[PDB]
Amino acid sequence: RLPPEVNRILYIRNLPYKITAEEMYDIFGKYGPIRQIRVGNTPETRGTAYVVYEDIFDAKNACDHLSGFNVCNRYLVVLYYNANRAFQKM
Amino acid sequence: AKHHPDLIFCRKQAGVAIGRLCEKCDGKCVICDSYVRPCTLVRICDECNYGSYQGRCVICGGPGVSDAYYCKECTIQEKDRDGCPKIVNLGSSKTDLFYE
Amino acid sequence: KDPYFMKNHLGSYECKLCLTLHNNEGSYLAHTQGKKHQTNLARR
Amino acid sequence: PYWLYKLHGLNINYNCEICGNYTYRGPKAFQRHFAEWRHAHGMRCLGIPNTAHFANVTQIEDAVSLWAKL
Amino acid sequence: ERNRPLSDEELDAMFPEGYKVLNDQPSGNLPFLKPDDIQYFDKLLVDVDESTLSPEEQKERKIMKLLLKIKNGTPPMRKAALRQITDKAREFGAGPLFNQILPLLMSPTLEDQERHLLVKVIDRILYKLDDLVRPYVHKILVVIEPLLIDEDYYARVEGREIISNLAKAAGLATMISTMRPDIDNMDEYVRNTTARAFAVVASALGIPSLLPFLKAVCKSKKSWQARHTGIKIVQQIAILMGCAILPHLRSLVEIIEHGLVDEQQKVRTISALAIAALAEAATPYGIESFDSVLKPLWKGIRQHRGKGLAAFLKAIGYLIPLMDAEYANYYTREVMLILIREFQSPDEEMKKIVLKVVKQCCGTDGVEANYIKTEILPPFFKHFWQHRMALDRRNYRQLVDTTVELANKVGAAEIISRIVDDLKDEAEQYRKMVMETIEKIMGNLGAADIDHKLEEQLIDGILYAFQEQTTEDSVMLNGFGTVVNALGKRVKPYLPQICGTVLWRLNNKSAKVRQQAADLISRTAVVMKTCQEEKLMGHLGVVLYEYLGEEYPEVLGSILGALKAIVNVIGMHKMTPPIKDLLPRLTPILKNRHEKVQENCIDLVGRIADRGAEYVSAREWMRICFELLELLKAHKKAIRRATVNTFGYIAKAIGPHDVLATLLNNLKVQERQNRVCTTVAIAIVAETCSPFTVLPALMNEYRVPELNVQNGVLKSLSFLFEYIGEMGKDYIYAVTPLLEDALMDRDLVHRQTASAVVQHMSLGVYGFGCEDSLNHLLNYVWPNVFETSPHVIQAVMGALEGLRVAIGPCRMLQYCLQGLFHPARKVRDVYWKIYNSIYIGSQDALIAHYPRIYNDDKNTYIRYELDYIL
Amino acid sequence: EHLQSKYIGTGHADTTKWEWLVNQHRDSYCSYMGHFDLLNYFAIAENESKARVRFNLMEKMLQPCGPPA
RNA sequence: CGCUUCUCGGCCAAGUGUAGUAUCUGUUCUUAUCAGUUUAAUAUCUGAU
RNA sequence: GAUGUCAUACUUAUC
């Protein structure tokens, strides 16, 4: 039993730019094995990242346990990946 | 309730059993579903409150927390003099979301 | 420069030639191409 | 068009015995022409005043009986 | 499908630029069909080619094709298929629909969602196919038979609703004729399902409608299987309708008394179960009903042993509170030895029946506490308090109920002295059951009987159960909170020993341990103010002020709840984490995407706006009011009810001049659950502050050429009128031209909002002399009753019900006059519904407002009583 | 459907004038038997007492308009 | 690492599921009578030239 | 004006 809005990929907004890849791998790997993690390296996409997990239940448990996580001095938000919302800039 | 048109009430003889409401539907009315200006409490029937059904929610059906009461717009419109406002059958409401 | 598309009092588009309504801006530009719009343009 | 004539009740033969048994191609058109100048000029020859009681009057004998009853 | 592994190209194609890495298609746009489901939709892979080769049954293939949109298609496509099959159920017929739905639901490779969609399609096509599925009643009953015995409660409720709809549509003779060969079947599960369906049909169609048929089925002596099925149907009807059975108890008891006398033990056990069930329901306290039945039950319980004796003991324990005091004292004095002798029974069902009968055997006078503590409680503690009983839920809940009944009857101290040794065990389920029993004993009886030699041991056991928790259950924290509430001032040498444990558990590698420590601090926050502990609460608040850096959001929400509980239990302006250094600290915490953490942050912001509004320089509130508009549109129904109260508190504190402009600017968003929340917040701000200051501004949002903004302004005005009530008599003349202009619009939603605002103004200003505006609005709301939308029709019905109570039933009868005998039936039905609503609203007022009717030739209708004058 | 069976006197779209007149006469008789002012006016208009007027009102409840048509 | 001086900075991608609904977009009836169901009256359907 | 496929938008303090 899982809603269809959840997926294997999860987006993160308003992330600190000084965060390293090891801290992001430790924060994403707490709920399960993380398959891939892509951080933005653009001024128009700064503060956002995409973490794709190997399991759907592990990705749902990671998305349920990352909305409003304690980080550096910004308000980061974790949301589900959408095809129509990610390509809104094009 | 007023949101789901497929919901039906009991409309039985209301006894001395007072209706109860859960924490998610606390303060809301039974018919008008309003949380402003309560006027009179709801009276449950004898079949809707017996054994394990005592102290349960009338709208949702879970464990009760607070006391159920009707709004001020239902007491003046003679809506509290009808039967028991207990939801018996749940159709197309909180059933497909649990399986999905 | 279409002299038939106007703005109503509800934030919509109204075609007075065929007397049609459109909610979004993308439906007014797609209503000019069709059978009823061509018939209203040829009749008037 | 046939759709505008079939949906609005047009192309339906109706006979009006008051105005010299004229033809009408619609119920709403006959109801609009009943309160008009032609029906008033047709009813003024028989001596019936133009009122609201003779709006749905078609026959001359029924209109004469309605004028004599009032 | 959702857990399938993907390649690198599919992962790279779903990501935008600017990121650094650290035939098989049936007739076109149909969804993907399963390889095992190519049998029911085998006629859809080929083309239709309708040219003098199209029978009517091929259109039934279209009824299969929409089923292809209903099984595994899109949810808008499934909604369109359901709307096409519900509106055309009469033209398609129930025959081919049942012939296409019967092998689809009976497939061995189905799923739960497909079965739920098939049950919803069968229930939705049952309202239009009334009195037509009588030959197809058996084919639907054979598919709805395993749905009632399913594991899920929702599927069982849907099957019971479908059985009730089939019993209401097929009547009583067809259901009795269809279930008549299904009683003497060889399969026991099919016979039990047929008995459950017959009990559901008897509950949905009335007890005397099926009482002589059940009496003829139970009184026939041809086989034991039919009598067992009748007894099982009677037991299911007694367990389904407790209240309904009570009246039929006398009859049901006369049919149940004929059983339990034959050579078959299964029929006697079924009759004993029906009598127990009956005692529970039919004639709940009807000892007389069990009179002619109490004499063979004691003989069967004393002369034989086994499952039948256990069923007779369960029936005696169920009928023992339904008798007098002397009868219960005589029954309890002769059944305690049989209950003590059956304590060493290896069967689980007999042990469960003994545990269920022990709770009812000692519930009144007659049973002494000393004999129950000497000869009943040591065998109940030695034979039932095991590790295998905590595995099953039915064996644990009944044991906890029996322990609570023994603590309420004998004493709470004698149960607390024997239940404290199992609190530090190695099993989680037994420790959770012991904690639940201790919480029930503390809630029902209390902790007054516990001395000083056991309270410290109980606190140590509760601390060992809370510190060694592996699941996410809230039973241990609730039990610790109930124990702290039962202790009160007796836990005064226990607060440092709990604080040193909470501070040690707040810093750990796990994430659930800090959340459990914060939940335990929140549950034990009310016990610190009543024990004169102010420095410890201040130290806990100063620790929780810096404990907001926990990366787990479930721990952060629990820390916010503990901070809110510490701010509620202590003073608002007397907290060592003061409001001057916490309200800017919670401003980035309110932008969380979670549900519970954002709800706790919104509750803390509302509490800080209600009790600490003088701790800011009127600058952070205007910045937090713009962030409160993003806290809505959440699927939790908890933050949206607190954000409106927080916006109303901010408008009452900083003045309703800045939040009203933000609420008007946020009304144009074109999104669901975002415009109604801002309208409710504006109505709460207008009801908390002066409603006149928001009176011209609400007239300004209707001046903008927008439909959504005008609809939101009308909804805000209607909600403000409904929240005001009697205070709307001064704001009726300002809203009367807006309601007169909104009802003449072409949009039906604006007319429905104007009708709702008129109904709110009628229900609020009723009895104040404002009938002129109501009579003016009723002239415009009267053409709005002929709409085709059900929502606009419901709004017009609510406006008519408000105008009949405000302007009087005479004006409602005069407005509905000359419409009951109307030629057009579409208006005559609405006029008859309005007349029925006016009669249900006020029936005595229609006597003086009735028009004068002349007498006919054969009948007289002139009221000669009221026409006379003295 | 169920509203006409539960609460008598409501009516439907296929209700005749005779049944509505009989329901209005029954409602007027119930209002005269319930209110004391109408019963006092009926007793002061005629020479009968309140009990005779109540018996005449209760005896006229069965078909107050006459046979149906 | 402790003290003094200058400058700068901070505070007081909002998604999914259910219920209903108003619009153009892609297409259709110049069949002339009789009888039946239904419709306030139209429209539509069913059999015979 | 009806019909059947697609799209847009709105409402009921729905979840």
- The answer to the question of residue A87 being in a domain is no
Render B32-92 in DSSP notation, one character per residue: S---S-EEEE-EEESSSSSGGGTTBBSSS-SB--EE-EEEHHHHHTT-TTSS--------S
Query: Please, which residues have CB within 8 angstroms of residue E10's CB and are 6 or more apart in sequence?
Result: none
Experimental approach? cryo-EM
What b/e readout covers E497-534, taking b as 16+ CB neighbours within 10 angstroms? ebbeebeebbeeeebbbbbbbbbbbbbbbebbeebebe
Sign of the alpha-carbon torsion through E194, E196, E199, E205 = negative
Cα end-to-end span (Å), chain E: 88
What distance in Å separates the CA atoms of residue E766 and residue B77, rounded to the nearest whole number?
Answer: 10
* Encoded tokens for F4: 């006409």
Which residue's entry shows tokens 């200006």? Answer: B37
Which nucleotide is closest, CA of B27 to its C1'?
H13
**Residue type for position F22:** V
* Encoded tokens for E311: 């069923």
CB atoms within 10 A of CB E425: 16
DSSP B72: H
Find out whether B82 and B11 touch, Cβ atoms under 8 Å: yes
Which nucleotide is closest, CA of D12 to its C1'?
G42
Alpha carbon D13 to its chain centroid, in Å, reads: 13
Alpha carbon E466 to its chain centroid, in Å, reads: 31
Q: How far is CA B85 from CA B30, B68, E520, E608, in A?
A: 6, 11, 38, 37
What distance in Å separates the CA atoms of residue E511 and residue A42, rounded to the nearest whole number?
Answer: 33
Find out whether C17 and C31 touch, Cβ atoms under 8 Å: no
Nearest Cα of chain A lies from the Cα of B64 at a distance, in angstroms, of 27
Query: Please, which residues have CB within 8 angstroms of residue E835's CB and are 6 or more apart in sequence?
Result: E813, E816, E820, F10, F11
Helices assigned H by DSSP within A38-88: 56-64, 83-86
Find out whether E805 and E764 touch, Cβ atoms under 8 Å: no
DSSP E30: P
* Encoded tokens for F25: 């006469």
Find out whether E321 and E356 touch, Cβ atoms under 8 Å: no
What distance in Å separates the CA atoms of residue A52 and residue E834, rounded to the nearest whole number?
Answer: 59
Burial of residue F13 (number of CB atoms within 10 Å: 0-12, 13-18, 19+)? middle
**Residue type for position E743:** L
The answer on whether B57 is annotated among ligand-binding residues is yes
* Encoded tokens for E569: 């239990």
- The answer to the question of residue B19 being in a domain is yes
What distance in Å separates the CA atoms of residue F6 and residue E412, rounded to the nearest whole number?
Answer: 52
Which residue's entry shows tokens 């369109």? Answer: E80
Return the biggest CA–CA distance within chain E.
Answer: 102
What distance in Å separates the CA atoms of residue C5 and residue C30, rounded to the nearest whole number?
Answer: 12
What distance in Å separates the CA atoms of residue E507 and residue A46, rounded to the nearest whole number?
Answer: 33
What distance in Å separates the CA atoms of residue B22 and residue B30, rounded to the nearest whole number?
Answer: 12
Phi, psi for E789 (deg, rounded to 5):
-80, 135
| C-alpha closest to that of E764 among E651, E687, E667, E852 | E687
Q: Is E829 on the interface with F (CB under 8 A)?
A: yes
Find out whether A68 and A77 touch, Cβ atoms under 8 Å: yes
**Residue type for position E276:** A
What distance in Å separates the CA atoms of residue D15 and residue D38, rounded to the nearest whole number?
Answer: 15
Indicate yes or no: CB of B96 within 8 angstroms of CB of E802: no
Q: At what angle do helices E307-319 and E325-341 cross, to 10 degrees?
A: 150
Question: What kind and span of H or E run contains D16?
Answer: strand D14-16
Q: Is E111 on the interface with B (CB under 8 A)?
A: no
Helices assigned H by DSSP within E72-187: 75-87, 89-92, 94-105, 112-124, 137-141, 153-170, 173-178
Helices (H) then strands (E): counts for chain D: 4, 2
Nearest Cα of chain A lies from the Cα of B98 at a distance, in angstroms, of 7
Q: Around E731, how many Cα atoms within 13 Å sit in the side-chain half-sphere?
A: 26
3-state SS, residue B20 = strand
Sign of the alpha-carbon torsion through E534, E537, E543, E548 = negative
**Residue type for position D23:** T
Phi, psi for F29 (deg, rounded to 5):
-70, -35
- The vertex-E148 CA angle with E145 and E152, nearest 5°, equals 135
Contacting residues of B for A3, CB less than 8 Å apart: 100
- The answer to the question of residue A89 being in a domain is no
Helices assigned H by DSSP within E586-674: 596-611, 620-627, 639-654, 659-665
Phi, psi for A49 (deg, rounded to 5):
-150, 165
Sign of the alpha-carbon torsion through F3, F4, F8, F12 = positive
Find out whether E565 and E604 touch, Cβ atoms under 8 Å: no
Nearest Cα of chain C lies from the Cα of E31 at a distance, in angstroms, of 28
Q: Is B24 on the interface with E (CB under 8 A)?
A: yes
Number of structural domains in chain A: 1
* Encoded tokens for B60: 């949702």
DSSP3 helix / strand / coil % (chain F, rounded to 5): 60, 0, 40
Report the residue of F7, F10, F38 to disrupt the E interface, i.e. the one with the largest count of E CBs within 10 Å. Answer: F10
Q: How far is CA E634 from CA E216, E292, E532, in A?
A: 58, 61, 41
Indicate yes or no: CB of E14 within 8 angstroms of CB of A90: no
* Encoded tokens for B88: 């018996």
Touching status, chains C and D (3+ beta-carbon pairs under 8 Å): no
CATH number, residue A22: 3.30.70.330
Number of structural domains in chain B: 1
Pairing of strands B43-45, C20-22: unpaired
What distance in Å separates the CA atoms of residue F54 and residue F32, rounded to the nearest whole number?
Answer: 9
Contacting residues of E for C7, CB less than 8 Å apart: 705
3-state SS, residue E86 = helix
The answer on whether B39 is annotated among ligand-binding residues is no
What distance in Å separates the CA atoms of residue E460 and residue E421, rounded to the nearest whole number?
Answer: 11
- The vertex-E562 CA angle with E556 and E564, nearest 5°, equals 105
| Segments forming the whole domain that contains residue A33 | 3-82
Strand-pairing partners, residue B57, are B20
Chain B CA closest to residue E636: B24
**Residue type for position A7:** N
Q: Around E816, how many Cα atoms within 13 Å sit in the side-chain half-sphere?
A: 28
Query: Please, which residues have CB within 8 angstroms of residue E837's CB and are 6 or more apart in sequence?
Result: E797, E800, E801, E804
Report the residue of B33, B35, B76 to disrupt the E interface, i.e. the one with the largest count of E CBs within 10 Å. Answer: B76
